[PDB]
DNA sequence: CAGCGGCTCTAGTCTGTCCAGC
DNA sequence: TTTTTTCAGACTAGAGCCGCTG
RNA sequence: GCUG
C-alpha cells in the first residue's frame, strides 16, 4: 500500500495493450460495445467503465510485491 | 557522437516504486529523483511545480461565488489550516504544505492592508458594497484552490519506471 | 556604485595553493576543473561543480534546461566513489554487463577480456535486452500483469 | 617575514583544533578561538616559535568514549619526512601507549616513509597532513556540505528503510579530503546534508570504500 | 521529384546473410530504425514497441 | 589451485585453451573472403 | 656505498569523428 | 631505391632521477 | 558525388 495510488502512464499502456490483444483473440467484452470494430477502441471503453479483468503486480526493488486492481487505481 | 555516449551510460537508470533511481546492478545512484521526487515536464513554474498566484486567479474567475460570505484575514488562515489537516495532505511532502501556508499567509496580509486602506469591514456591513470586491476570497474558492494544488502536485510526481536516465541523456544532447 | 570590489581571476590549475596564499579567502575560492575540485574538496563538492559548470555553460548559450536533468547526470557521474567521466573508459567502471560495453566502443577487447574471465552477465538494461530480443525491465516491463479471471485455490477431494 | 610564518602556525593550529573538535577530541574553546596576537604571546618570531617541538599537541582526548584515547599532532621541522623522523615519532607514541597521531608535514614526505604508515601497525595509525591543506578549513568552505559520521544503529535503519545491502550505497574514497578530515575508515557511512535552492534540505548517504 | 522518392515495403526480399530487409528502394529496401530512433523509444518507455519493431518486424 | 589466481574461471576456460591447436571452421550459413582465408590456412598447413 | 621506491617524463599507440536516404 | 593527403587523447609500457634507506 |  506504500506504492502510489494513481495508475502510471506505463501501467495504462500495458493494461490496454494486453486487454486489446485478449479482445482481438475473442475474449468476452464486458462493456456492451456499440458499433466498435477495433480492439484498442473497445479496450479503452472498458477502462473508462472500470471493468477490465487484470491485476497489476508492482514489484519493489528488494523483491517484495504489492498487487493493485485496475479498478482500485485512480485513472487520470 | 556525444548523444550516443550519454545514452550508452544513462539508459539503464529508471525510477522505481520505492522512489529511488537505481542502476540495473541495483546500486543506488539517487534516493529520490532531483531530491523533491518531482518530474521536470510536469513543472509549471521554472523548476517549481505549482506557480500558486496563477492557480488562485483561475479559481476566483472560474468559480466566482456571488451570495457567499467573503470573510477574510483571521478566517482565511483558520479555514486553510483546517483544510490542510484533513487526512489528505499528509501524503504531500511537508515542504510543499509549508509553501502553501506561506502563500496563504501572504494573501491574508494583502487583504488586511487593502481593508485598512479603504474602510475595514466592521463585520461585513460597510455601505459601498463595491468595496468588498477589492480582495475577494470566498470559502468555496479556498476549498477549490487547496484541492487543485494537491492534485497538481500529486500528478507532478515522476512515475515509477519513467526511464529517468534515458530522458536526461536525450535532454542534455538537444 | 555603493561598494566597488576587486576579485582576482587566476588562469591556472593548483587550487590548493591558490586557496592558501595569504589574502585569498579559501572559503569562497572555486574552480572550473572538476578533477582539481574533486582532489581538493571531496566528492560532494565535485558533484556540485558538475551541476554548476554544466548549468553555467548551458545558460550562457541561451539553452535553458531543467536542473533535474543535470542533478541526475552529475549524480550518476559521481556515485561510485570517484568522478567517472562518460568516456569509453568511464563505462567500464560503471557497468558490469558485457554486451552493453561491447555495443559501445572497443568491441574486440571487451569481448575477449570477458571471455578470459568467466563473465556471467545477466541480461538487463536496455542495450542487451534489445540485442537478445527480451522485453526490457525499464518502462512498461517494470510491472507484471495478472488476470482477475474467476479462480481460487480450491479444496481437493477426499482420497 | 616572521609575520607570515607565525600566521601559518596560528591558522594551522586553529584548523587542527577545529579538526579535533569535529573528530570528537576534547579541545577547550580558548584553544578553538585564538587570535594571532594571543598566539604571539605564547611565541612570536620564527626562531622563538619552533615548529618541531613547541606546537606538538597530545592534549586532544576522546572525551565521548575514552579519556585514555589520545591523539598526538606532530609537526616535523624537516620539509620532507623520512622513516627516521617517523620512527622517532613512533617511539614517543609507543612509550605513552597512544595509538593515533597526526603528522603535519611542511612540503611533503619521502616515498619510503609513506609506505611505512600503511604497515607500521594496524594498531598504530598515523595520518599524513600537508600544512598547505590545513591553512583552510574545508568543512567551512561554501561548496562542501555538512558531513555527519553515522552510528551503526543508524546505518542499520538506513539499510532497513530502503531494504538495501551496504554495497548498493554510493561510495566515497578514503583518500577523499573530507574523509581524511574526519578520519573515517572503510565500512563507515557518512550522512551528507546538501542545501536546496529553497530553505529546505536533501539528505544523502555514502559508503567509505 | 516525389514520384522517384516514394518507397513503401511490407514483406519483401530479405538479405541471405542476416535475414534482415534490403537497403535499397530498387531492391525493395526497408527502413533502418537506427540507434537514435531506438534511444527515443527507450525514453518513451515503450518496451513492446521496441521488441515488435526490432525483432518481430525485422529478424525473429 | 593456481588457475583462480590467474583470474580465469576454470569452468569457462583454462590457461592452455589460449594457444591454438584446432580452429572451428565456420558454419557455411555465416559465410555466403573468410572462406578464402580458410583455404590459405589449409594450404599453409 | 649501495639499493629500490616512487617519481616523472616523453613518446608511444589505438581510438573515435550524426542520421540516414538515393 | 622516390612525398603527404586531420586532430586530439588519456591510457601503456620503458628510459631515467635523485635521494634517502638501508 | 549529391539530396535530405
Taking contacts as CB-CB distances below 8 angstroms, the residues of chain D near B30 are 204
E47 is in an annotated binding site: no
Domain ranges of chain D: 1-136, 137-209
Query: Over chain A, what HEC string results?
Result: CCCCCECCHHHHHHHHHHHHHHHHCCCCCCCCCCCCCCHHHHHHHHHHCCCCCEEEEEECCCCCEEEEECCCCECC
DSSP designation for C147? E
E17 part of contact set with chain A, CB < 8 Å: no
Range of the domain at A13: 1-76
CA C108, C109, C113: angle at the middle one, nearest 5? Answer: 125
E24 part of contact set with chain A, CB < 8 Å: no
Domain count, chain A: 1
SS3 C68: helix
Residue at shortest CA–C1' distance from G7: D111
Give yes or no for a contact between D60 and D99, defined as CB atoms under 8 angstroms apart: no
* Separation CA C105–CA D155 (nearest Å): 39
Q: Count the Cβ atoms, other than its own, within 10 Å of residue D168.
A: 18
Classify burial at D149, counting beta carbons within 10 Å of its beta carbon; exposed 0-12, middle 13-18, buried 19 or more: middle
User: Does the beta-carbon distance from F8 to C115 stay under 8 Å?
Assistant: no
Asked if strand H contacts D112 at the CB level, meaning under 7 A, the answer is yes
Half-sphere exposure of D87 (CA within 13 A, CB side): 4
Asked if strand G contacts C103 at the CB level, meaning under 7 A, the answer is no
Asked if strand G contacts E25 at the CB level, meaning under 7 A, the answer is yes
This structure was determined by cryo-EM
Q: What is the largest CA-CA distance in chain E?
A: 37
User: Does the beta-carbon distance from A8 to B160 stay under 8 Å?
Assistant: yes
Residue of F nearest to C120 (CA): F12
* Separation CA C74–CA C83 (nearest Å): 9
CB-contacted nucleotides of strand H (7 Å): 10-11, 20-22
Query: Over chain D, what HEC string results?
Result: CCHHHHHHHHHHHHHHHHHHHHHCCCCCHHHHCCCHHHHHHHCCCCCCCCCCCCCCECCCEECCCEEEEEEEEECCCCCEECHHHHHHHHHHHHHHCCCEEEEEECCEECHHHHHHHHHCCCCCEEEEEEHHHHCCCHHHCCCCCEEEECCHHHHHHHHHHHCCCHHHCCEECCCCHHHHHHCCCCCCEEEEEEECCCCCEEEEEEEEC
B74-84 helix and B94-117 helix, angle to the nearest 10 degrees: 160
Asked if strand G contacts D112 at the CB level, meaning under 7 A, the answer is yes
Amino acid at each position: 500500500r506504500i506504492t502510489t495510488p494513481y495508475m502510471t502512464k506505463y501501467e495504462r499502456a500495458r493494461v490496454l495493450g494486453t486487454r486489446a490483444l485478449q479482445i482481438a483473440m475473442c475474449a468476452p467484452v464486458m462493456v456492451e460495445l456499440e458499433g466498435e470494430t477495433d480492439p484498442l477502441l473497445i479496450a479503452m471503453k472498458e477502462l473508462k467503465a472500470r471493468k477490465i479483468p487484470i491485476i497489476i503486480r508492482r514489484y519493489l526493488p528488494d523483491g517484495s510485491y504489492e498487487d493493485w486492481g485496475v479498478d482500485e487505481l485512480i485513472i487520470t | 557522437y556525444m548523444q550516443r555516449r550519454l545514452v550508452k551510460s544513462l539508459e539503464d537508470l529508471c525510477s522505481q516504486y520505492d522512489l529511488t533511481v537505481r542502476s540495473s546492478t541495483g546500486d543506488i545512484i539517487q534516493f529520490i529523483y532531483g531530491g523533491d521526487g518531482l518530474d521536470p515536464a510536469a513543472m509549471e513554474g521554472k523548476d517549481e511545480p505549482l506557480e500558486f498566484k496563477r492557480v488562485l486567479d483561475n479559481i476566483k474567475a472560474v468559480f466566482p461565488c456571488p451570495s457567499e460570505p467573503a470573510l477574510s484575514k483571521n478566517e482565511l488562515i483558520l479555514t486553510t489550516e483546517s483544510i490542510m489537516k484533513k487526512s489528505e495532505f499528509l501524503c504531500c511532502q511537508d515542504s510543499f504544505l509549508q509553501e502553501i501556508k506561506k502563500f496563504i499567509k501572504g494573501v491574508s496580509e494583502k487583504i488586511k492592508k487593502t481593508r485598512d486602506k479603504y474602510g475595514i469591514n466592521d463585520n461585513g456591513t460597510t455601505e459601498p458594497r463595491v468595496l468588498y470586491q477589492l480582495d475577494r476570497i470566498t470559502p468555496t474558492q479556498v476549498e477549490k484552490f487547496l484541492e487543485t494544488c494537491r492534485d497538481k502536485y500529486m500528478r507532478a510526481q515522476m512515475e515509477p519506471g519513467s526511464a529517468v536516465g534515458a530522458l536526461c541523456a536525450q535532454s542534455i544532447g538537444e | 556604485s555603493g561598494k566597488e570590489k576587486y576579485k582576482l581571476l587566476v588562469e591556472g590549475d593548483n587550487l590548493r595553493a591558490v586557496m592558501a596564499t595569504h589574502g585569498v579567502k579559501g572559503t569562497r575560492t572555486t574552480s572550473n576543473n572538476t578533477y582539481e575540485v574533486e582532489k581538493t574538496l571531496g566528492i560532494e563538492a565535485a558533484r556540485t561543480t558538475i551541476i554548476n559548470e554544466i548549468q553555467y555553460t548551458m545558460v550562457n548559450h541561451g539553452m535553458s534546461i531543467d536542473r533535474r536533468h543535470v542533478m541526475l547526470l552529475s549524480d550518476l557521474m559521481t556515485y561510485k566513489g570517484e568522478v567517472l567521466g562518460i568516456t569509453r573508459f568511464g563505462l567500464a567502471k560503471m557497468k558490469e554487463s558485457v554486451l552493453m560495453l561491447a555495443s559501445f566502443e572497443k568491441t574486440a577487447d571487451h569481448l575477449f577480456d570477458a571471455a578470459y574471465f568467466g563473465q556471467k552477465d545477466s541480461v538487463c538494461g536496455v542495450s542487451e535486452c534489445i540485442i537478445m530480443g527480451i522485453p526490457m525491465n525499464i518502462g512498461t516491463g517494470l510491472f507484471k500483469l495478472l488476470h482477475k479471471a474467476d479462480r481460487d485455490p480450491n479444496p481437493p477431494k477426499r482420497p | 617575514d616572521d609575520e607570515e610564518e607565525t600566521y601559518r602556525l596560528w591558522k594551522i593550529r586553529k584548523t587542527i583544533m577545529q579538526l579535533c573538535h569535529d573528530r570528537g577530541y576534547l579541545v577547550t574553546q580558548d584553544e578553538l578561538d585564538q587570535t594571532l596576537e594571543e598566539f604571539k604571546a605564547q611565541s612570536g618570531d620564527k626562531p622563538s616559535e619552533g615548529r618541531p617541538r613547541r606546537t606538538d599537541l597530545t592534549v586532544l582526548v576522546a572525551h565521548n568514549d575514552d579519556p585514555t584515547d589520545q591523539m598526538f599532532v606532530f609537526f616535523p621541522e624537516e620539509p620532507k619526512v623520512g622513516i627516521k623522523t617517523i620512527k622517532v615519532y613512533c617511539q614517543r607514541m609507543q612509550e605513552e601507549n597512544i595509538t593515533r597521531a597526526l603528522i603535519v608535514v611542511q612540503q611533503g614526505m619521502t616515498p619510503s616513509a609513506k609506505q611505512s604508515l600503511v604497515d607500521m601497525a594496524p594498531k598504530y595509525i598515523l595520518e599524513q597532513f600537508l600544512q598547505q591543506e590545513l591553512l583552510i578549513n574545508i568543512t567551512e568552505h561554501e561548496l562542501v556540505p555538512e558531513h555527519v559520521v553515522m552510528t551503526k544503529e543508524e546505518v542499520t535503519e538506513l539499510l532497513a528503510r530502503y531494504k538495501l545491502r551496504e554495497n548498493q550505497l554510493p561510495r566515497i574514497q578514503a583518500g577523499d579530503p573530507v574523509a581524511r578530515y574526519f578520519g573515517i575508515k572503510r565500512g563507515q557511512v557518512v550522512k551528507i546534508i546538501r542545501p536546496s535552492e529553497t530553505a529546505g534540505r536533501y539528505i544523502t548517504y555514502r559508503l567509505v570504500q | 521529384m516525389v514520384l522517384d522518392k516514394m518507397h513503401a515495403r511490407a514483406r519483401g526480399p530479405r538479405a541471405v546473410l542476416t535475414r534482415q530487409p534490403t537497403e535499397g528502394r530498387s531492391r525493395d529496401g526497408g527502413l533502418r530504425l537506427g540507434e537514435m530512433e531506438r534511444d527515443c523509444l527507450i525514453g518513451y518507455g515503450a518496451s513492446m514497441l521496441l521488441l515488435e519493431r526490432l525483432m518481430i518486424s525485422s529478424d525473429a | 589451485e593456481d588457475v583462480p589466481l590467474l583470474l580465469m574461471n576454470p569452468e569457462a576456460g583454462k590457461p592452455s585453451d589460449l594457444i591454438l591447436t584446432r580452429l572451428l571452421v565456420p558454419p557455411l550459413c555465416i559465410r555466403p573472403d573468410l572462406t578464402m582465408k580458410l583455404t590459405e590456412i589449409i594450404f599453409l598447413n
